[PDB]
Amino acid sequence: RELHPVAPLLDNLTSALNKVYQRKGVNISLDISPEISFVGEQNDFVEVMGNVLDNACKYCLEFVEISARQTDEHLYIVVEDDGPGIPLSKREVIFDRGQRVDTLRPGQGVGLAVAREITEQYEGKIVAGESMLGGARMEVIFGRQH
Ligand SMILES: Nc1ncnc2c1ncn2[C@@H]1O[C@H](COP(=O)(O)OP(=O)(O)NP(=O)(O)O)[C@@H](O)[C@H]1O
Ligand SMILES: [Mg+2]
C-alpha cells in the first residue's frame, strides 16, 4: 500500500490547529524523524491524529509534545500534554460511543471511539495514559505497516 511521510502530515495538522487555538497560545513541539512513514489511507491517519491532537490542544494548559517511532510492522505516535489528564477510571470509557449530539465546532474530529476503530482496521489501537507533564499521554499505534 501507499507510503505517506508522517512529518509533513503532522505539520499540516499542527498548522491548522495553531489557527483554531491561536488565542490559547499552545506550544506544539514535534520530534518526528524524516524517515517515519504511514502505510495505508492518508485520511485514516489524519482523522485519528487530528482528533487526538485537537484534544491535546483543547485540554492542555500550554504544552503539547508529539513524538513518533516505527518498527517493521508498526507505527507509534505519542501525544502528550500538560493538562488535567484523563482520570484512571475513565481511560476505558472514553473509547466507547457517547452522546456526541451536535458538538460540531469547526475543528471537532471523529471522536476517540471512531479513532480507535480506525486504528483497529490497521490491527492497531490507542492507549490512554499519563504524560510526564501529568496530563494525558495518548499512544496511537497502527499495525499492518509491512
Ligand atoms: N488530551 C486529553 N486531556 C484531557 N481529556 C481528554 C483528552 N483527550 C480526550 N479526553 C477526554 O475524553 C473525552 C472523549 O474524547 P473524544 O472522543 O475526542 O471527545 P469529543 O466527543 O470528540 N469532544 P472533545 O473532548 O471536544 O474532543 C473528552 O470529552 C475528554 O473528556
Ligand atoms: Mg474530538
Side-chain angles (χ1 to χ4, degrees):
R1 180 117 187 57
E2 96 240 318
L3 194 71
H4 308 281
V6 166
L9 294 180
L10 291 177
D11 225 309
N12 288 170
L13 275 176
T14 296
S15 281
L17 276 283
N18 276 331
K19 285 186 177 180
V20 174
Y21 296 95
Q22 52 197 353
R23 135 147 162 175
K24 180 170 181 175
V26 174
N27 161 235
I28 299 173
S29 56
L30 308 179
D31 291 305
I32 315 298
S33 198
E35 83 285 358
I36 294 166
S37 300
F38 166 70
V39 175
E41 273 299 345
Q42 209 174 311
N43 288 350
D44 286 345
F45 180 79
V46 183
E47 281 184 350
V48 173
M49 295 311 312
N51 192 75
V52 175
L53 296 183
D54 172 71
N55 278 156
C57 292
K58 177 175 176 165
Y59 298 108
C60 74
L61 293 173
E62 174 174 22
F63 305 97
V64 170
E65 308 192 327
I66 309 175
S67 58
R69 76 188 178 93
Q70 74 190 4
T71 50
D72 301 328
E73 311 191 28
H74 297 87
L75 169 62
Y76 306 80
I77 310 298
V78 175
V79 179
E80 298 198 328
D81 63 65
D82 63 0
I86 296 168
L88 180 72
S89 67
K90 272 45 205 165
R91 294 174 192 173
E92 215 156 298
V93 303
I94 63 184
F95 293 109
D96 295 327
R97 301 257 169 176
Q99 184 121 52
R100 308 180 74 237
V101 173
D102 174 278
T103 297
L104 47 67
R105 46 179 167 79
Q108 186 52 272
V110 305
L112 284 178
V114 171
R116 182 136 135 299
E117 301 186 327
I118 293 173
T119 65
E120 292 175 327
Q121 292 173 18
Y122 294 84
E123 297 171 22
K125 66 181 179 177
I126 297 180
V127 303
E130 185 177 291
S131 62
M132 179 81 79
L133 313 174
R137 170 193 181 77
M138 306 296 308
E139 173 159 24
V140 174
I141 306 171
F142 291 92
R144 298 188 66 84
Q145 299 298 289
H146 197 129

